[PDB]
């Protein structure tokens, strides 16, 4: 199903792996998806998070606080966590229900808050972005693009 991801959504997922690698992490978790959505910096997900005051630095600090880094950066393919897998599966249905045949950055973000339980969700709540508020912000920005 990655073939239905937009270019930018694929770049998100590719960057999430490197977010994990550069923290000396050995799985790609939901929090690395969150880092990648913000760090890629152009799509509706990034805009939605910026517009709620969720910054790359705030997320990095919470990931250091909650997870911490390993001793060494791994080479080769880093596997998705169970919850990251769930997020990416959910993203497909967020896209279809919003009337899209491709999975964009916003649908990954929506999948992440739909999953609602892993490290990224914990970080968003800690930083003051309640999951319903995040969802409604995405809907609000998408509605503005219908003009």
């Amino acid at each position: 199903m990655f073939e239905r991801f937009t270019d930018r959504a694929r770049r998100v997922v590719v960057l999430a792996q490197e977010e994990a690698r550069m923290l000396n992490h050995n799985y790609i978790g939901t929090e690395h998806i969150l880092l990648g959505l913000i760090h890629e910096g152009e799509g509706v997900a990034a805009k939605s998070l910026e517009s709620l005051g969720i910054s790359l630095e705030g997320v990095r600090s919470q990931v250091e606080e909650i997870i911490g880094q390993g001793q060494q950066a791994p080479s080769g393919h880093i596997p998705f966590t169970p919850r990251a897998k769930k997020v990416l599966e959910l993203s497909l249905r967020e896209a279809l229900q919003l009337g899209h045949n491709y999975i964009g950055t916003e649908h990954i973000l929506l999948g992440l808050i739909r999953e609602g339980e892993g490290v990224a969700a914990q970080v968003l709540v800690k930083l003051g972005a309640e999951l319903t508020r995040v969802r409604q912000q995405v809907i609000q920005l998408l509605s503005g693009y219908l003009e």
């Binding site: 694929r10 997922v13 590719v14 790609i28 880093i78 897998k85």
Partner: peptide
Amino acid sequence: WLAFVLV
């Protein structure tokens, strides 16, 4: 799909 980037 769905274990690694991008399988």
